[PDB]
């Protein structure tokens, strides 16, 4: 009975090294043992900074909303993290 969550990471306008900032999000998800199902844009585009100030993810998570949100909020230099269970 795992869970699927839609996640939207919004970065501030000036955010530097955005691909590394987003990597921290992926690193946190992996630490929580979540599996990334889909992303916007593609993982390749993310790694090449072919995006603006936001990244979307669909993940399978062994942890719930409260622990997931707490974990994602521990990352600095992020304007907002939108999380919705699907």
């Amino acid at each position: 009975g795992f869970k699927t969550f839609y996640i939207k990471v919004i970065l501030k306008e000036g955010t530097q090294l955005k691909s590394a900032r987003i990597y921290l999000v992926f690193h946190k998800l992996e630490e929580l043992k979540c599996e990334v199902v889909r992303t916007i844009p593609s993982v390749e585009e993310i790694e090449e900074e072919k995006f603006e100030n936001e990244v979307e993810l669909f993940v399978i998570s062994p942890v719930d909303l409260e622990k997931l949100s707490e974990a994602l909020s521990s990352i600095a230099d992020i304007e907002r993290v939108i999380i919705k269970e699907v």
Binding site: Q16, L17, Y23, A76
Partner: protein
């Protein structure tokens, strides 16, 4: 719980970080100019947080991160980088670093990094 070990070759850069740290309610545990000295200071000072400059590859900040991680697997390291260094930063994070800040230092960003790593 707010003691920081500052590692950076440039005295001016360490000064700017000390200023931000003090104003933000944290304290300077000590400082190092290179990675070898960083590991030695880590053992003797037992800081809560370490800021590690990796802007100069020749300085080998990445190796100092790995050495500090060996000494203490629970070490909290914030990497200090420059624009265009996303690959090095990602590499530092995989090596154990918890977060990163980018030069020139923006006080609000440094403050949030310090707060979040804690």
């Amino acid at each position: 719980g707010k003691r920081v070990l500052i590692v950076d070759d440039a005295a001016f850069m360490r000064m700017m970080l000390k200023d931000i740290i003090t104003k933000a309610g944290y304290e300077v545990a000590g400082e190092a100019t290179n990675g070898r000295e960083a590991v030695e200071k880590y053992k003797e000072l037992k800081p809560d947080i370490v800021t590690m400059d990796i802007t100069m590859p020749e300085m080998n900040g990445i190796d100092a991160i790995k050495e500090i991680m060996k000494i203490d697997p629970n070490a909290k390291i914030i990497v200090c980088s420059a624009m265009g260094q996303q690959a090095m930063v990602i590499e530092a994070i995989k090596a154990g670093a918890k977060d990163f800040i980018v030069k020139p230092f923006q006080p609000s960003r440094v403050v949030e990094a310090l707060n979040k790593v804690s």
